[PDB]
Amino acid sequence: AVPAPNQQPEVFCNQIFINNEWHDAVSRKTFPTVNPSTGEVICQVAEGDKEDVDKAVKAARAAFQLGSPWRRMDASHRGRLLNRLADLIERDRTYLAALETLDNGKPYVISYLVDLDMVLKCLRYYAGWADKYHGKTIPIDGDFFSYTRHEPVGVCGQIIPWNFPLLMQAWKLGPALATGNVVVMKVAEQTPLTALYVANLIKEAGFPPGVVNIVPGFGPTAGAAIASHEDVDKVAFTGSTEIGRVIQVAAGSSNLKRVTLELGGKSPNIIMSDADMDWAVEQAHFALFFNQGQCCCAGSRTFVQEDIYDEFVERSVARAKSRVVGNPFDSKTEQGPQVDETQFKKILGYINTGKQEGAKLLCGGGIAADRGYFIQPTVFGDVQDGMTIAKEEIFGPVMQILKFKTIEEVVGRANNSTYGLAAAVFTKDLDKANYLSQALQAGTVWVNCYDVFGAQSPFGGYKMSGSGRELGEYGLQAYTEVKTVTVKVPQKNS
Amino acid sequence: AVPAPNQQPEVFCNQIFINNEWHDAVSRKTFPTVNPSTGEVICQVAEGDKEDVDKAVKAARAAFQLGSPWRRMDASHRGRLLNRLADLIERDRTYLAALETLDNGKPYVISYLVDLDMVLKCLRYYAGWADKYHGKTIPIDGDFFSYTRHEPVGVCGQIIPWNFPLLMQAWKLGPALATGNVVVMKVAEQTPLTALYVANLIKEAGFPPGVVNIVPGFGPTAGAAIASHEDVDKVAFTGSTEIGRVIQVAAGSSNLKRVTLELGGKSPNIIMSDADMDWAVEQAHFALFFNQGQCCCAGSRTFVQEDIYDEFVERSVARAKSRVVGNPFDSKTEQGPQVDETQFKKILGYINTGKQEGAKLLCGGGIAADRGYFIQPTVFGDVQDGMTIAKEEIFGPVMQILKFKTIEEVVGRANNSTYGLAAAVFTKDLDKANYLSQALQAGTVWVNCYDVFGAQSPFGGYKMSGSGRELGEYGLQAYTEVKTVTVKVPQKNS
Amino acid sequence: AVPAPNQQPEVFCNQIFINNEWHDAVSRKTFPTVNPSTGEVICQVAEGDKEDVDKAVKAARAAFQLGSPWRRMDASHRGRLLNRLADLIERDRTYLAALETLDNGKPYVISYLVDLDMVLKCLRYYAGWADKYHGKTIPIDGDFFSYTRHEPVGVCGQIIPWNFPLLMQAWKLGPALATGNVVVMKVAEQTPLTALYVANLIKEAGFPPGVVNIVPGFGPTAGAAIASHEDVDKVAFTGSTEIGRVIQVAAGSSNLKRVTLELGGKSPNIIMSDADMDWAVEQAHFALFFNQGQCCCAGSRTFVQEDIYDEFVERSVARAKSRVVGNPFDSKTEQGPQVDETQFKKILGYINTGKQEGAKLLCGGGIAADRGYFIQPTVFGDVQDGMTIAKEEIFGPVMQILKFKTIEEVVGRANNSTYGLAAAVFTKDLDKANYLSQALQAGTVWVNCYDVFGAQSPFGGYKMSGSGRELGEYGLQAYTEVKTVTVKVPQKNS
Amino acid sequence: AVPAPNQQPEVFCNQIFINNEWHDAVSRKTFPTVNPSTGEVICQVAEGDKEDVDKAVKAARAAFQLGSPWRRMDASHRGRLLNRLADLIERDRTYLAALETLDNGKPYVISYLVDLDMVLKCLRYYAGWADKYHGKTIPIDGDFFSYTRHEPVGVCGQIIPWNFPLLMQAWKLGPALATGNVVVMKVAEQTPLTALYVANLIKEAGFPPGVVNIVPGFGPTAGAAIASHEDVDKVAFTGSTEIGRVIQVAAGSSNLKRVTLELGGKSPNIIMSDADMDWAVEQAHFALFFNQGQCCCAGSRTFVQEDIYDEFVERSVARAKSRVVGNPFDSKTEQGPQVDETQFKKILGYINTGKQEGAKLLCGGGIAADRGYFIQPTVFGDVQDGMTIAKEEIFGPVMQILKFKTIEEVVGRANNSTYGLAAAVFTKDLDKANYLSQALQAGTVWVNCYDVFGAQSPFGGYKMSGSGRELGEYGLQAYTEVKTVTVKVPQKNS
Ligand SMILES: O=C(NCc1ccc2c(c1)OCO2)c1c(Cl)cccc1Cl
Ligand SMILES: O=C(NCc1ccc2c(c1)OCO2)c1c(Cl)cccc1Cl
Ligand SMILES: O=C(NCc1ccc2c(c1)OCO2)c1c(Cl)cccc1Cl
Ligand code: NA
Ligand code: NA
Ligand code: NA
Ligand code: NA
């Protein structure tokens, strides 16, 4: 049940947001952001660089000074401000969902019902944590009173991706602001607009100036400037595994800022022979093709027990052949365009590679429209662990189906990856679900479902899929600096 | 492996323990403790009364005075003392095991491998908690520093049953001592001996005098004096639901002391048609017959799905007839005698009451030896929910087997009870297991097992099976008094 | 900026509230509620009794059924509902504040700025807890997966007092509803009206029918009915220690329902000779006289070190004489009337008692007006520990000032009470502060302040001031029932 | 009351420890470890490099395989093993104490009463955590059951320093083993002996082969090997801020392993004018001179209020001159030799800068014995913030005394450092205490004490003193990898 979208939403924010004001870049340069459905430019956006990041960091540092409005504010009041922000986002939900669809390509129905819903749920979840993340009083030996203070880490540099622009902004801001930090945020060049607008709403909500600063721009410039900045206390980066390597080195090279990363994956989706066939087929489709395949936790390795392989495959092809690709503003559209021409071309490449390395093309495999970055839903069968398409993140509507015989075999094959973001298991058997959930080396294990996120439950990678967790109580850990205070007392008693 | 037992072990402690010293009752009166296996007196025990509880409580109060050795001792040291006590108990394991069997009647092999293992594991678990039950520092509104101290509740009265004499002592002392409380404990007249020997070890381990005081005696006398005492801060009572209510009333009429209760049960053991038959049969036998059926969480309503009912009943009667009843010191014996004559008569009465209401007596039904309180492993088939034996706690080797058709049915029938201590579900199905464990109104739900206890996991009743939880972190809650300290500061900052 | 009050607000709700609907008593009976300022009837209210409670409990039980809208609702959505209730209460703040003052007698400026603000803060605080009170996964011995579910305790009977009608309602509803329980609430006959109007807002907020039910009526009838009810799972009572006793006995005689109590106190306010004199004198006046002295935690024993005694007393008496008594709607008013004629008389009796037993009456001591129930702020000096006014809760504007010499002395005297709700220490010295805060046997110790409450920090009694805690994370404990699920697994690994 | 030392303890272990066996370096190269009191070689030690590290990592990885004895072991049993290891270390206490003094130089009385006591206390503390670090059950949105498993991070590389050889080993092993990780440990070339002996005790204790592996060697070889190893999951480094940056860059350039750092400091010790003079002077002495000044948290900037400055300086100089230097095994010795030639020369270098830059050398200043790396207790007065000795970590017995006026001024000065490991405040004033503890940007703030460690309380740096915390519950975090398991259920209910 969804409000009709404005199919050409106006843009009101496209600059640098520092101290609750809008700036051009110091260089006065701009860059274009494109509508992926048409390939035409939406507008130019302020192209931030090191000098701009420098202004934002100083503004945040100022806001963080002992005795500032933000530092003195009651924790409960930080929660009031987060709740007010969620309220304003709801007020503007229909507009934001459309703007999201315009800049990103995802279907408006999904932006509205999924993304913006999750944004509201995330911010309202963290609003509640603001005054509940207690330190401890500690029964240390001797005549001492010892306790810990949970203080903010300080100035947090936050780098976010283009696949879920508003949701990722929320995943970062929620825990950060709940714990009284200040942020310098770099948004993706492919999708800067919606986070920029939310910045205006952060102003409207009443956050003191400098508490949230947003610098659009490129990675080799704006992003690198953040990771390497000498007065940034903490960096949180979501993006490719390859770039997460650059970030941590830059943190080592600079001021030894604390680092968390959310990176790529090649998550195994395991279908046992006792699985509910219909449910598992639809879920495996969802697991892979959701959001044009542009999900770090995409179920891009579908392991199917040989007894049910043939039928599972037949039903999966039928579903993929009937997945509607088209204008993201049409309510019937299941899959919009890929985010840009670079991804468009990289995905086509992987398709070309999968055919060459002997995988069996079951459907799709081509461009799905002559304008915009639309790709046919694609399904490869008889995929082998050694193939490129079975090892590398494609980040597109390309499905991999593999065949296995035993539960021991599959555990080994599933875990034989340098990735470890997520995994799933479909089975009716209690013992099989418990065996696999324990044995799978992944940050999240779904059982008879996929892509089930809740602001209550932590998310993050094992292995090279990242480190640290977002969401849940766990999402607060990376944003807290712990101070022990130990006080001599006349005579300690229990 | 089990050392050969001393079948008539010497008794060294048979009086009232106060201030690490042994006292006669102030009346000098004593009572007999009997060997359940023969019906003969083992020895006399000091019969503690109100005047003896008063002495015990005054001693405990003095030990709890601010600045006392017990109050000043580091938390980690209370932990060291508990580990030392466990070490001492293990040193005297073979002796304690045999004395447990002599006074209580359970098989020596079980006293040694189960009861004593569990006593050691309980004490060592709680030793670990001594210095880890943190208070909080709290982001309170305004210019204040606010925190909580987790202090001991104070003088705790503890009344334990006769079914697991040593283990029940450990479940009480573990948490209370870990958190720095002092104890006045009343032990069952049926089984005073092992608990009094452990008082010797407590002194030997170095607990300051008055920290643990033990008063053997009767219920309406010593036990009542504890529950009704004006200077006792907290009572923990394990026993029947009936006496559980005397305790809460006595607390309310006196000083409004804090109360926790571990009462009776009539726990449902649910076997679905897709259970592993062999496993389900043995586990169901175990679930009911363990400890001569003297378990508050005995699976005394065995619900079996109609499709497998017949096979289940045949296998269950075969197993009940094979159960060896004899001298608990004989290694072949699976079942010792009931704890005393009162229990002996009562259980026999219940069997009669069941042969009345048209339940099929399938085996046993009668006395099993002309010497001692031995009762034949009894099975009732085709039991109906309205029958007295399907409603009331028997506390003897009497198994009730009921039939059911659907999952909705068994849920309602299982839940239709004023008891809710435990429950079990046997099934291979993920969803059935999850549906039932959520739906069942019980303090503990075991899946594909029964009587699985861990010091790590809490245990306690829903409904009239008690309130509060023992074991786990949760067992600390009832023994902690929370103090908020809120301090005016010059200027609060995050 | 306090909006001008309507001195005669309209009454919209005066019936029994069940299933989100307004009912007359089955008996059709009503009782008058009085304006303690004029002594004249405001209106009549439905007089609920056993049969009305029974209907409410049934409605509550029905709303609690597995699969019901309240049981199935996302934890996070319970939070949304609590947040909406707060918004509506804030929308109607001016009205509720005026209504509170009409029925209770407290100054309108205080109803508006203190009570209402605290209600909003309590509700918004607990809103945040709804989806954050996690159960545990537990490293139990053996090949098992063991975890705890934190389930709602169930049908909760809440009996609340007249001193803080709206605030006490919120302190009870917040934790109960955050944790998914259902409520049958008995409001005070002196002050039923504001609670009933809030019921209307509960409906407007969208809480399912039967989740909150309110039965206005008397104590020995509606109150006792809830306490003794066989289908009420938990009872929370705030009132006199004497009635707390009846509540506990009732719980024990019936179904062993869980019980928490917030009872009376005789809280010591300790002023060291090195305290800021001006601040100490204002805070001491506030501590005793706030809300016409009708606070469970009133600083009703003011201990003042002998070096500063004569000056403190002189300043205290001066402050008491200038305290403005009169019309609670008049901004100039500091002190309204006591709540009713029963309290009025009780306070006059204690005043006479004080004079009779030799306490030095320094000011007031009598009736301050003819209409209503106004009492002169009264100060006794040279009070001794053995005096009745030094021991018993007066619950009126009657201050006790006692002289002490040493910090070791004052600890014993402060602690020599059957009460232990709160205490305070005024001193500039770090060591004196830490010494006293540790040594004082009280649920809350304020340092250099008094009556500092935060939804974040727990509050409750030691000894006979009650058991359990309200506010903070601690306030969730009594509203939770712990279920252990222990599942057999093929092979346990770390 | 310290048992007599063996002043020339025999060495039993001097090789590489892998799989509970002793190995020569693959290259058979060795290196001398020297007694710093005499400058004479104690013995040769296996010089491990990359190849030996690879052997140790493979051993660790194997011990960590699902289904291995270490993986299947009950968590409570891991605790039993830690406690057993502690008992063994206690058995060998005088021996390890003497060998520590022999290889490191610290006085045997301190090694015995401080280092080994703290090793015992740390290991016993973490033993208790083994089975108590619960994951969560989470009330996620929707029809799901969601929980977290707290799993081990896996193969942990641990690089420890030479200043507290045994204690640092325990600080790393306690948490890592309590949570069921496996370790590859690199010990400092200056002090490899006591840690290798503890490896024998780990074997004796019962730890499976490969769970703990120790590779002595140099930093740029063995250490860099661990940090860059593609199969090490986590690294914990304690050492110079300079090296810590190498560690974080290796992490980033290899496998993105998780990293924690405990680095250097320049901690401020703040003496307010109302401090207790005698106490403050003796504690300022201890704060800096402890462990030959070889403490990361040394109070190396002693800020003293101008009103008591002169008296404080005179008293400090007097105490410094009386500080006994010499043979660490002599009971009168307060200060042993520095650890090695490199440190010796670097300290003398800093003393030279201090003189060159115009700091008043008040006592000491050079070599204190003709044999061994003994340096005189040195005090510089009237130090200025800009001086090299006020800024850089000296890590020797060189005291900086600075003069200040206001509390605001000194906060700004103390916080003007890229270090933030610890700090201390001396004052009798409640408000001053609270103001400073909050305001100081340090990982630990001591009040009226210094160098007060407890296993219960976390320790770690702000800014460039490190990241992550050791000790306490917090110390378990870096050693846990969190897994979310989200399960579809028939129907979610509260
Ligand atoms: O729509 C859902 N997930 C889609 C999804 C996929 C990848 C994502 C995501 C949501 O959030 C960030 O990454 C979804 C579902 Cl089917 C069930 C429960 C909760 C949720 Cl949120
Ligand atoms: O106005 C306050 N207390 C008044 C008060 C007294 C007794 C009470 C109460 C509020 O709530 C229940 O009992 C108050 C103050 Cl002065 C400082 C901080 C927070 C608060 Cl809430
Ligand atoms: O002797 C102590 N500290 C000395 C010390 C200094 C630096 C350290 C350390 C111990 O452990 C690691 O770093 C000490 C003191 Cl005076 C009081 C309580 C507890 C402790 Cl352990
Ligand atoms: Na775009
Ligand atoms: Na007996
Ligand atoms: Na009234
Ligand atoms: Na050496």
- Domain with C417 in it: what CATH number? 3.40.309.10
* DSSP code, position D470: B
Determine the residue of chain A that is closest to B78 in CA distance: A494
Q: List all residues 6 or more positions away from D94 whose beta carbon is below 8 Å from its beta carbon.
A: D3, D4, D5, D6, D112
Q: Are D54 and D221 in contact (CB under 8 A)?
A: no
* For ligand 1, mutation pick of A104, A114, A263 (most atoms within 8 Å of CB): A114
Is the CB of B494 inside 8 Å of chain D's CB atoms?
A: no
Nearest to D395 by CA among D242, D244, D288, D262: D288
Beta-bridge partner residues of B484: B148, C444
Q: Are D328 and D101 in contact (CB under 8 A)?
A: yes
Pocket of ligand 3 (CB under 6 A): A 142; D 114, 118, 164, 167, 290, 295, 451-453
* DSSP code, position D48: B
Tell me how crowded residue C54 is: count the other CB atoms within 10 A of its CB: 16
Is the CB of A442 inside 8 Å of chain D's CB atoms?
A: yes
| Atom number, ligand 2, closest to the C-alpha of residue C117 | 21
Q: List all residues 6 or more positions away from A93 whose beta carbon is below 8 Å from its beta carbon.
A: A112, A116, A120
Nearest to B85 by CA among B167, B190, B207: B207
Q: List all residues 6 or more positions away from D406 whose beta carbon is below 8 Å from its beta carbon.
A: none
Tell me how crowded residue A195 is: count the other CB atoms within 10 A of its CB: 26
User: Can you tell me the distance from the alpha carbon of B279 to that of A275, in angstroms, rounded to the nearest whole number?
Assistant: 25
* Residue for token pair 């016409």: C292
Say if residue C480 is in the same domain as residue C449: no
Say if residue D426 is in the same domain as residue D355: yes
Q: Are C198 and C172 in contact (CB under 8 A)?
A: no
Query: Which residue owns the Cα nearest ligand 3 atom 15?
Result: D452
Nearest to A257 by CA among A153, A173, A146, A385: A153
Q: List all residues 6 or more positions away from A354 whose beta carbon is below 8 Å from its beta carbon.
A: A361, A380, A383, A387, A388, A389, A398
User: Can you tell me the distance from the alpha carbon of B361 to that of D27, in angstroms, rounded to the nearest whole number?
Assistant: 79
The answer for A95, left when phi > 0, alpha when psi is -120 to 50, beta otherwise, is alpha
Say if residue A435 is in the same domain as residue A294: yes
Q: Are C434 and A493 in contact (CB under 8 A)?
A: no
User: Can you tell me the distance from the alpha carbon of B245 to that of B237, in angstroms, rounded to the nearest whole number?
Assistant: 10
User: Can you tell me the distance from the alpha carbon of D424 to that of A486, in angstroms, rounded to the nearest whole number?
Assistant: 9
Q: List all residues 6 or more positions away from A353 whose beta carbon is below 8 Å from its beta carbon.
A: A388, A389
Tally of CA atoms within 13 A in the half-sphere of A55 that contains its CB:
19
Q: Tell me if A76 and B492 make a contact (CB, 8 A cut-off).
A: no
Å from CA of D487 to ligand 5 middle: 49
Q: Is the dihedral of CA C388, C391, C396, C397 positive or negative?
A: positive
Which helix or strand (DSSP H or E) is residue C492 part of?
none
Q: Are B37 and B372 in contact (CB under 8 A)?
A: yes
Distance from CA of D464 to the nearest CA of A (A): 6
D262 is catalytic: yes
Q: Are D399 and D380 in contact (CB under 8 A)?
A: yes
- Enumerate the active-site residues of A: 262, 296
State in Å, rounded, how far the first CA of chain B is from the last one: 59
Q: Is B342 exposed, middle or buried (0-12, 13-18, 19+ CB in 10 A)?
A: exposed
Distance from CA of D428 to the nearest CA of C (A): 6
Say if residue C69 is in the same domain as residue C37: yes
Name the binding residues of C: 239-244
* For ligand 3, mutation pick of D169, D334, D453 (most atoms within 8 Å of CB): D453
Which residue blocks in C228-305 are alpha helix, DSSP H? 241-253, 277-289
User: Can you tell me the distance from the alpha carbon of C191 to that of C104, in angstroms, rounded to the nearest whole number?
Assistant: 6
Which residue blocks in A322-445 are alpha helix, DSSP H? 341-356, 407-415, 430-439
All residues of chain C having their beta carbon less than 8 Å from the beta carbon of residue A475 are none
φ/ψ of A8, rounded to 5, equals -135, 75
Is A240 annotated among the ligand-binding residues? Answer: yes
* β-strand pairing of C40-46 with C30-35: antiparallel
CA distances from C321 to C106, C276, D401 (A): 19, 22, 55
Q: Tell me if B482 and C488 make a contact (CB, 8 A cut-off).
A: no
Which residue blocks in A426-466 are alpha helix, DSSP H? 430-439
CA distances from D80 to D74, D87, D127 (A): 10, 11, 7
Which helix or strand (DSSP H or E) is residue B16 part of?
strand B16-18
Query: Which CATH number covers residue A481?
Result: 3.40.605.10
Nearest to D244 by CA among D11, D36, D467, D451: D467
**Between residues 217 and 246 of chain C, which touch chain B (CB distance below 8 Å)?**
241, 244-246
Neighbors of chain A by Cβ distance (3+ pairs < 8 Å): B, C, D
Q: What tokens does D242 get?
A: 């300079």
User: Can you tell me the distance from the alpha carbon of B183 to that of B176, in angstroms, rounded to the nearest whole number?
Assistant: 8
Q: Tell me if D434 and B489 make a contact (CB, 8 A cut-off).
A: yes
Say if residue C156 is in the same domain as residue C286: no
**Segments of B286-326 assigned E as strands:** 301-305
Neighbors of chain D by Cβ distance (3+ pairs < 8 Å): A, B, C
Q: Tell me if B141 and C456 make a contact (CB, 8 A cut-off).
A: yes
User: Can you tell me the distance from the alpha carbon of D80 to that of D88, in angstroms, rounded to the nearest whole number?
Assistant: 12
Determine the residue of chain D that is closest to B439 in CA distance: D493
Name the binding residues of B: 239-244
Å from CA of D291 to ligand 3 middle: 10
The answer for D221, left when phi > 0, alpha when psi is -120 to 50, beta otherwise, is alpha
The bound ligand whose nearest atom lies closest to the alpha carbon of A339 is 4
Q: Tell me if A443 and D482 make a contact (CB, 8 A cut-off).
A: yes
| Atom number, ligand 1, closest to the C-alpha of residue A295 | 7
Say if residue C366 is in the same domain as residue C395: yes
Å from CA of A183 to ligand 1 middle: 26
Which helix or strand (DSSP H or E) is residue A31 part of?
strand A30-34
Polymer length in residues for chain A? 494
Nearest to D175 by CA among D454, D479, D437, D492: D479
Interface test with A, best of C122, C125, C432, C440 (most A CBs within 10 A): C125
Q: Are D97 and D112 in contact (CB under 8 A)?
A: yes
Three-class secondary structure of residue A44 per DSSP: strand
Say if residue B214 is in the same domain as residue B301: no
| Atom number, ligand 3, closest to the C-alpha of residue A144 | 18
Q: What is the dihedral of CA C212, C216, C220, C224, to 10 degrees?
A: -10
Q: Are A127 and C86 in contact (CB under 8 A)?
A: no
State if residue A453 touches ligand 1 by the CB under 6 angstroms criterion.
yes
Say if residue B446 is in the same domain as residue B301: yes
State if residue C282 touches ligand 2 by the CB under 6 angstroms criterion.
no
Q: Tell me if B136 and A139 make a contact (CB, 8 A cut-off).
A: no
User: Can you tell me the distance from the alpha carbon of D123 to that of C154, in angstroms, rounded to the nearest whole number?
Assistant: 43
CB pairs under 8 A between A and C: 71
Determine the residue of chain C that is closest to D144 in CA distance: C74
User: Can you tell me the distance from the alpha carbon of B301 to that of D16, in angstroms, rounded to the nearest whole number?
Assistant: 60
All residues of chain D having their beta carbon less than 8 Å from the beta carbon of residue A447 are 485-488
**Between residues 81 and 110 of chain D, which touch chain A (CB distance below 8 Å)?**
none
Is the CB of B73 inside 8 Å of chain A's CB atoms?
A: yes
Q: What tokens does D23 get?
A: 């190995």
* Residue for token pair 């009921």: B402
Distance from CA of B70 to the nearest CA of A (A): 8
* β-strand pairing of C234-238 with C212-214: unpaired
User: Can you tell me the distance from the alpha carbon of B83 to that of B76, in angstroms, rounded to the nearest whole number?
Assistant: 11
State if residue D142 touches ligand 1 by the CB under 6 angstroms criterion.
yes
Q: What tokens does A449 get?
A: 């479902």
Number of domains into which chain A is organized: 2
Query: Which residue owns the Cα nearest ligand 1 atom 14?
Result: A452
Q: Tell me if D431 and B490 make a contact (CB, 8 A cut-off).
A: yes
The answer for A292, left when phi > 0, alpha when psi is -120 to 50, beta otherwise, is left
Is the CB of B493 inside 8 Å of chain D's CB atoms?
A: yes
User: Can you tell me the distance from the alpha carbon of B97 to that of B120, in angstroms, rounded to the nearest whole number?
Assistant: 12
Which residue blocks in D15-92 are alpha helix, DSSP H? 50-63, 69-72, 75-91
Nearest to D431 by CA among A172, C402, B492, C91: B492
* β-strand pairing of D135-138 with C135-138: antiparallel
State if residue C453 touches ligand 2 by the CB under 6 angstroms criterion.
yes
Say if residue D257 is in the same domain as residue D279: no
Q: Are A439 and D66 in contact (CB under 8 A)?
A: yes
Å from CA of D190 to ligand 3 middle: 22
State if residue C340 touches ligand 2 by the CB under 6 angstroms criterion.
no
State if residue A170 touches ligand 1 by the CB under 6 angstroms criterion.
no
Break-preceding residues in chain C (C–N over 2.5 Å): none
Q: Are C429 and D426 in contact (CB under 8 A)?
A: no
Indicate the angle between helix axes B165-178 and B116-129, nearest 10 degrees. 10
Q: Are B475 and B175 in contact (CB under 8 A)?
A: yes
Indicate the angle between helix axes A116-129 and C116-129, nearest 10 degrees. 120
φ/ψ of D15, rounded to 5, equals -125, -170
Is the CB of D50 inside 8 Å of chain C's CB atoms?
A: no
**Segments of B264-337 assigned E as strands:** 268-271, 301-305
Which helix or strand (DSSP H or E) is residue A274 part of?
none
Beta-bridge partner residues of C149: C483
User: Can you tell me the distance from the alpha carbon of C268 to that of C271, in angstroms, rounded to the nearest whole number?
Assistant: 10
Tally of CA atoms within 13 A in the half-sphere of B73 that contains its CB:
24
CB pairs under 8 A between B and C: 192
* Residue for token pair 């999850």: B434
Q: What tokens does B211 get?
A: 């920290």
| Domain region containing D269 | 265-454
Is the CB of D477 inside 8 Å of chain A's CB atoms?
A: yes
Nearest to C245 by CA among C418, C377, C383: C418
Is the CB of B125 inside 8 Å of chain D's CB atoms?
A: yes
Q: Are B415 and B266 in contact (CB under 8 A)?
A: no
Q: What tokens does A98 get?
A: 């459309």
Q: What is the dihedral of CA A65, A70, A75, A77, to 10 degrees?
A: 170
Say if residue A249 is in the same domain as residue A307: no
Å from CA of D494 to ligand 1 middle: 22
Say if residue A233 is in the same domain as residue A317: no
Indicate the angle between helix axes C93-104 and C193-205, nearest 10 degrees. 150
Q: What tokens does A313 get?
A: 């495959």
State if residue A166 touches ligand 1 by the CB under 6 angstroms criterion.
no
Say if residue D229 is in the same domain as residue D277: no
Polymer length in residues for chain D? 494
All residues of chain A having their beta carbon less than 8 Å from the beta carbon of residue B489 are none
Is the CB of A180 inside 8 Å of chain B's CB atoms?
A: yes
